[PDB]
Amino acid sequence: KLLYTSANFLGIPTNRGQPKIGTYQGPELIRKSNFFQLVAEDGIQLTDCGDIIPVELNEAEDPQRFGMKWSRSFSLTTLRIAERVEELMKQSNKSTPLVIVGGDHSMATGTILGHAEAKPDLCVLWIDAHGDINTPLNSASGNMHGMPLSFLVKELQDQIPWLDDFEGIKPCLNASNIAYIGLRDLDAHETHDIRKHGIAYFTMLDVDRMGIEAVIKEALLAVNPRLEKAIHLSFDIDALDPLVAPSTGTAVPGGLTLREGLRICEEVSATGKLSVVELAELNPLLGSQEDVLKTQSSAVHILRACLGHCRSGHLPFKVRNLTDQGIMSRAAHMQ
Amino acid sequence: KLLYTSANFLGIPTNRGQPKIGTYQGPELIRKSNFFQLVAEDGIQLTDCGDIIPVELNEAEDPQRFGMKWSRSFSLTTLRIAERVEELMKQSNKSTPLVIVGGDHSMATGTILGHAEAKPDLCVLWIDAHGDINTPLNSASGNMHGMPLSFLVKELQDQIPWLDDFEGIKPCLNASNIAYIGLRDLDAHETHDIRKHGIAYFTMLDVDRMGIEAVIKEALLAVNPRLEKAIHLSFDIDALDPLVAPSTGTAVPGGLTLREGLRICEEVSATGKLSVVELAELNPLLGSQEDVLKTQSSAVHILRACLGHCRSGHLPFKVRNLTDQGIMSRAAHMQ
Amino acid sequence: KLLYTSANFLGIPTNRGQPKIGTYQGPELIRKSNFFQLVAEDGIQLTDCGDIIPVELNEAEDPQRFGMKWSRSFSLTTLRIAERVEELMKQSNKSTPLVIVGGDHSMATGTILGHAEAKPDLCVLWIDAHGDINTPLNSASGNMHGMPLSFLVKELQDQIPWLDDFEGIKPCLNASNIAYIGLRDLDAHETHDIRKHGIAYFTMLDVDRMGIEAVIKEALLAVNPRLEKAIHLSFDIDALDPLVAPSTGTAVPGGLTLREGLRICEEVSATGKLSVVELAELNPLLGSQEDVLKTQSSAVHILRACLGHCRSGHLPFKVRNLTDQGIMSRAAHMQ
Ligand SMILES: N[C@@H](CCCC[B-](O)(O)O)C(=O)O
Ligand SMILES: N[C@@H](CCCC[B-](O)(O)O)C(=O)O
Ligand SMILES: N[C@@H](CCCC[B-](O)(O)O)C(=O)O
Ligand SMILES: [Mn+2]
Numbered sequence A, B, C: 001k002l003l004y005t006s007a008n009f010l011g012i013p014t015n016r017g018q019p020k021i022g023t024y025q026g027p028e029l030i031r032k033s034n035f036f037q038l039v040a041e042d043g044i045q046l047t048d049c050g051d052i053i054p055v056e057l058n059e060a061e062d063p064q065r066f067g068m069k070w071s072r073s074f075s076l077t078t079l080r081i082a083e084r085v086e087e088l089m090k091q092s093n094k095s096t097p098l099v100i101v102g103g104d105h106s107m108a109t110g111t112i113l114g115h116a117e118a119k120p121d122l123c124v125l126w127i128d129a130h131g132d133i134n135t136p137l138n139s140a141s142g143n144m145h146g147m148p149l150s151f152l153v154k155e156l157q158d159q160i161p162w163l164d165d166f167e168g169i170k171p172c173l174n175a176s177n178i179a180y181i182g183l184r185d186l187d188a189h190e191t192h193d194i195r196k197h198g199i200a201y202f203t204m205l206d207v208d209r210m211g212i213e214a215v216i217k218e219a220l221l222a223v224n225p226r227l228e229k230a231i232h233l234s235f236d237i238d239a240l241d242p243l244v245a246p247s248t249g250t251a252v253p254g255g256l257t258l259r260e261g262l263r264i265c266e267e268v269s270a271t272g273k274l275s276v277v278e279l280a281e282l283n284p285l286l287g288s289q290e291d292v293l294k295t296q297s298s299a300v301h302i303l304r305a306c307l308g309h310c311r312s313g314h315l316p317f318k319v320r321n322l323t324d325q326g327i328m329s330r331a332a333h334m335q
């Protein structure tokens, strides 16, 4: 009755990937919700594996390099994340998905690095308004949360400056292993790199013209044709329209409806190959109290879908009956 | 030019079906709106038939029984509603639809009971995020608004405890006469009962995959194949997304857009078989002032659609002409 | 790489077309946004051509006539607008689109009059919840913003009262040159006139049943079958759902999503025939501060789409390279 009967949960409160304080509170926003209770009610055993502690150096220890802000905090955090994720995914070798709540999206370099150590043939589905694939010299902002894929993609390595402390961050993805859904705010150089290297991508224009059902099918066909590969689902909450997820740092109008977001997660979950899902860029310090509740709510529905929640209902584990309790039914009485 | 040239309007301010105070104000929220004026502007004669007074016993007279809260208030209210609705529907035997504004959804047991006395072969279209079909021993909350269909469905009667005061509540529906649209939060035992007894149901997943146009067609095909039966349309305002109907007691994200809600009502109206439409679960005491206005607005658009309002326009009853008033037109002047 | 490499921008702060103060601030709402910057970032040279000064007479000089409010302010403003637009469109005879920001929708009589002087064979795509085609004796409100097309449509001229000061407002459109998208609140007499004279129209019902992709295609087929004609795109911000454009004077629920609005503008832009786009009915004095930001944001996305912005990305004008700066890449280092 369940594709996944257990799962692990991990918080990664990254906040040095971008300048707005508050992504560090994303994991708590989910823990304070009814997520755990709802997952248990569906028959899934979810273990809270705690939080990764990011490395947050001071300004003096971590000056700008190649325009990148907090790049040594990033490289050290990346290795610490990768070790923890690798360990969890290997203890897991019905499989046991790992649910990761961020934290800004810079955590993805580490989560995918560690995941790939455990599952080298994985594919990545990146759900985001943005490409998050800027190389350091092309980034206008120097914010690491806009660069996490660039360090992982083998075809991009001639455009990444060498730094000694980045050595352990080995590019573990081919361009052919990634597919985007939800894009609507790409930087020019991202557009160039995505098209040059043939990365599968489905922008909001494609979703409008094709419909989300065909988009999901084509994205899975592009990177996981026969469902042979483990799936790393990297979900930026800002992929969803700001009407349903306002509390995030770089909101862009015209995003996925919650329903469209649910359909992506339902289909990925149903492959039986969901290995890691991470949800990035929750920021409970942004927007009104009601904005935060809407965003928390959307996130909870999304994550539950990833774990197998069905909108069309679940059957009871045990079917209750009146006679058992010694109670008289209307039907019995009429007889 | 009109499928329905007259209609009746009835308020049922039920509030003992669920614990949040304020559903009793639903009928006034519609009367205070421009609904009546707009319906008249479409050429429909709408008669306000007043309000049913619910029976609201005190705690001492109405203790919990089989976990149900306010079950004797419910049984007495149900019979009082059924008598009034039966009387109105028989005085009506182009037909004259009855528009009912609630009130929490527990009123439906009474409205359908009385409707079926006048029209025994009716079908029911239940538009709701929820199944409202819990039997009393399976209800986690004991709230009657989550159980109204269970008492009506013949196939369920071995799961309903006998109570003397429920005797006059005779099951008048077969499972084959009901179809749901909009479901996204079913309890496990509801899911079990719906599937076991073959009740037609179209959840938000079905709406996503099939599109609302096909869903409406399939729902009508399932319970009213050749448009031979009178239609009881039971519309829970919470079927609509909380972005358009926030002021309701059990809001669930990812609901029908207003447009999708309009399409259901337009198609049902256009069958010529709309006999009763009820709109349940408005609660003007929930949310901000603007939340209440949004919810009132959505409700008014929905109800107008049920009565035949066309978004593509209506023709004037009399076409005005310049010469008639002795006025010179530009065309006339140029000649 | 660009269909349009330059464009002109003009503000028309009309506010005598309707009673709510604030449409006069629409052009500033766009100038205060990041619109200009974003358009430049796409490689388009946009020239701000300033604002037209509307003629605003006093009550004594401009009494009601045929029930019309401020009709002489309207006729004088119309001629002043038409002269300015004609001059700009002729200096422009890759073409150079003119972007016009209003201002209430009464400005359209002038913008289309002047546009047609420069391009007599134009077609009009009118994106609006409303018909804006009431003739003066049928208007319930006497607000000119609800009548701008009636003065332009040749087939309607026997229903327009003659006024000497309207003489220079020559009907320059055939009914066959106009198509509506987005309608959901037509007056009865508008409905009558649209159907009688065969004006192509796609209401929200049509958008629901056909989908926006087919609607856009059919609208262009109806008025511009082989893309031979210049396009005047008249976009009332109230065509969009009040959830995305709340700050406008006559909001109607159940409108176009931003995405649907974007698709209209993208397809019109891509014809290469976009000659004028005007955006009407922004009112920054309506709604909360956040309402105004949402409305400004929607307007900016819409206008950028009209000018060729692609949600699927743009390529860089110059591709940056590491070696050029004398920087060592990871790939280089490994070798
Ligand atoms: N492309 C921009 C925005 C990055 C957005 C980061 B993301 O998708 O995690 O929110 C940048 O490089 O700064
Ligand atoms: N299934 C829940 C919720 C019922 C919701 C009631 B309704 O759809 O009228 O809002 C219960 O039995 O308590
Ligand atoms: N049909 C109404 C409303 C007009 C709406 C004007 B428009 O579309 O510019 O907002 C009237 O004549 O007053
Ligand atoms: Mn993003």
Ligand SMILES: [Mn+2]
Pocket: A105, A128, A130, A132, A145, A236, A280, A281
């Ligand atoms: Mn991201």
Ligand SMILES: [Mn+2]
Pocket: B128, B129, B130, B236, B238, B239, B250
């Ligand atoms: Mn409900």
Ligand SMILES: [Mn+2]
Pocket: B105, B128, B130, B132, B145, B236, B280, B281
């Ligand atoms: Mn209900």
Ligand SMILES: [Mn+2]
Pocket: C128, C129, C130, C236, C238, C239, C250
């Ligand atoms: Mn309008």
Ligand SMILES: [Mn+2]
Pocket: C105, C128, C130, C132, C145, C236, C280, C281
């Ligand atoms: Mn308009």
